[PDB]
Design a protein around this ligand. Structure first.
Ligand SMILES: *Cc1cc2c(nc3c(=O)[nH]c(=O)nc-3n2C[C@H](O)[C@H](O)[C@H](O)COP(=O)(O)OP(=O)(O)OC[C@H]2O[C@@H](n3cnc4c(N)ncnc43)[C@H](O)[C@@H]2O)c(*)c1C
Ligand SMILES: *[C@@H]1O[C@H](CO)[C@@H](O[C@@H]2O[C@H](CO)[C@@H](O)[C@H](O)[C@H]2NC(C)=O)[C@H](O)[C@H]1NC(C)=O
Ligand SMILES: [K+]
Ligand SMILES: [Zn+2]
Ligand SMILES: [Zn+2]
Ligand SMILES: [Zn+2]
Length: 473
């Protein structure tokens, strides 16, 4: 067909329907949302990426990059059938490392586990990114990237010092603080909007030698306990929590909430740093035993797998997810949250679900040392990052009536807050919002600048997906 012929003439490898490569590359991480691209360009070089974009232009197609394919909305496909899909996951190398500056150049199909493995094993270096080893560098870094080092060292995006980008017109350009700084600003938080990143240029830190994983089983058996407890954790997060502590409250057992965390220091140093919160928690919590880790052991520890060096996709899932970023959860917000928690959520027994309340902001959070004005990322004024997750078996159909579960929980918080108090996080992409509403909540106070930037770098909407920023001049 026209697109196949076009790709072939340009020397761009293409997946053939019916082959193993096609079957692998076309599989969404969220099998709730499969999409059928018109063709899959399995790129090996920056030139292939540029050729693919060129082919999209001449055949008037929409083009979408897929890196680790972890988009909760399958946006790597385009969020709909019929795009040219630029499949990036064979481009996995740390192109170069500079031992004078600590800057690594990295290909856009490297997964977080593979990246961490190469930087640590080969160079003794580390970056602050997410926990899941199969996640793509590109989708992740482009929109933020939060994990168990973000309090200490900031977002994955905060490591970005430069990018090589393929634009909607197929030109290759460099972006950094001193070259195309407007484009650089957009890539660092809304990067799916402005081109396909071909090379990430990343600042690293020495791989930590002394880390302690900690956990506390909270044992909140009623509404009172959970209200008092979430309050105690916010206060600590807002005012006390030292730089070295990274943690969240999570519940993976429909009523068995815990704190899990990573501390930059010894077990004794953690205990002293956390003790003020321990003194305010409702009585009946149990401090679980600590685990002493080095950098690469910690990556493995929070993995949920027996290895981390992933160069292929991780097992697919079948789910819906939502998110919230909040200034505070105090007042009616936490009251409504806890009611719903016990009256509704804890009686949902037919599938696996979770929430995570991430300590994202607060006084000593590195995330918060960058303003909303400095990069595309719009949540620098938010203490909490919240994930809600609703997962069925792969052989089951996600039922239409099941959406209202996470919808209800999110509403219970939002109805209690002014609109300026909360947003949503595009790395926990929720496709059940129209283009205008979603970009309002994903990008906050930065949306007006993003729209103007979009009208400069993608006026035709070549990179269209249902939740892309609108080009507005
Ligand atoms: C599946 C999964 C996701 C997780 C997990 N844990 C996370 C955590 O510890 N911290 C977080 O902050 N987020 C976590 N997430 C969510 C993921 O971070 C997001 O789902 C990321 O967006 C995933 O990125 P990726 O795997 O690369 O997703 P894609 O579906 O390929 O792309 C998403 C988005 O990005 C665009 N895009 C891809 N590639 C490029 C390039 N090269 N240039 C520009 N834009 C690109 C896509 O088109 C799409 O729009 C844990 C788990 C298990
Ligand atoms: C919620 O649960 C907690 C403990 O799980 C309750 O506190 C316990 O119950 C009574 C009343 O305070 C005390 O005699 C116990 O010793 C408490 N146990 C612990 C471990 O502290 C609390 O009362 C409950 N709140 C309610 C039911 O409203
Ligand atoms: K198609
Ligand atoms: Zn590897
Ligand atoms: Zn308080
Ligand atoms: Zn293994």
């Amino acid at each position: 067909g026209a697109i196949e012929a076009c790709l072939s003439a340009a020397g761009v490898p293409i997946d053939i329907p019916g082959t193993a490569d096609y079957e692998r590359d076309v599989e969404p991480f969220n099998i709730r949302l499969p999409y059928i691209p018109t063709a899959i360009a399995q790129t090996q070089t920056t030139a292939h990426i540029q050729s693919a974009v060129q082919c999209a232009k001449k055949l008037n197609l929409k083009v979408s990059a897929k890196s680790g394919g972890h988009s909760y909305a399958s946006f790597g496909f385009g969020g709909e059938n019929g795009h040219l899909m630029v499949q990036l996951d064979r481009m996995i190398d740390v192109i170069s490392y500079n031992d004078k500056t600590g800057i690594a150049h990295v290909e856009p199909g490297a997964r977080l586990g593979h990246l961490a493995t190469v930087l640590n094993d080969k160079y003794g270096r580390a970056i602050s990114h997410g926990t899941c080893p199969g996640v793509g560098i590109s989708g992740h870094f482009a929109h933020g990237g939060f994990g168990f080092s973000s309090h200490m060292h900031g977002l994955a995006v905060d490591s970005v010092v430069g990018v090589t980008v393929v634009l909607a017109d197929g030109r290759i350009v460099e972006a950094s603080a001193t070259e195309n700084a407007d484009l650089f600003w957009g890539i660092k938080g809304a990067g799916s909007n402005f081109g396909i990143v071909a090379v990430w240029k990343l600042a690293t830190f020495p791989a930590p030698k002394v880390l302690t994983r900690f956990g506390v089983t909270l044992n909140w058996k009623n509404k009172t306990s959970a209200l008092k407890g979430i309050e105690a954790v916010e206060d600590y997060a807002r005012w006390v929590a030292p730089r070295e502590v990274n943690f969240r409250i999570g519940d993976y057992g429909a009523g068995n909430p815990g704190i899990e965390g990573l501390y930059y220091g010894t077990p004794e140093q953690w205990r002293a740093a956390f003790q003020p919160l321990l003194d305010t928690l409702p009585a009946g919590y149990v401090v679980n035993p600590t685990t002493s880790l080095n950098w690469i052991e910690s990556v493995l520890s929070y993995s949920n797998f027996d290895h981390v060096d992933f160069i292929t996709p991780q097992p697919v899932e079948n789910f819906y997810a939502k998110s919230l970023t909040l200034k505070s959860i105090k007042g009616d917000a936490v009251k409504n949250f806890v009611d719903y928690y016990f009256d509704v959520s804890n009686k949902v027994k037919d599938r696996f679900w979770f929430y995570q309340l991430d300590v994202h902001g607060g006084k000593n959070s590195q995330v918060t040392k960058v303003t909303n004005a400095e990069t595309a990322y719009p949540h620098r004024d938010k203490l909490w990052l919240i994930q809600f997750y609703d997962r069925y078996d792969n052989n089951q159909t996600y039922p239409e009536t099941s959406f209202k579960f996470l919808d209800g929980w999110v509403n219970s918080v939002t109805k209690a807050l002014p609109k300026s108090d909360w947003g949503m996080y595009i790395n926990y992409a929720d496709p059940r919002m129209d283009r205008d509403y979603a970009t309002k909540v994903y990008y906050g106070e930065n949306l007006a600048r993003l729209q103007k930037l979009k009208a400069k770098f993608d006026p035709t909407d070549r990179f269209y997906y249902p939740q892309a920023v609108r080009p507005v001049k």
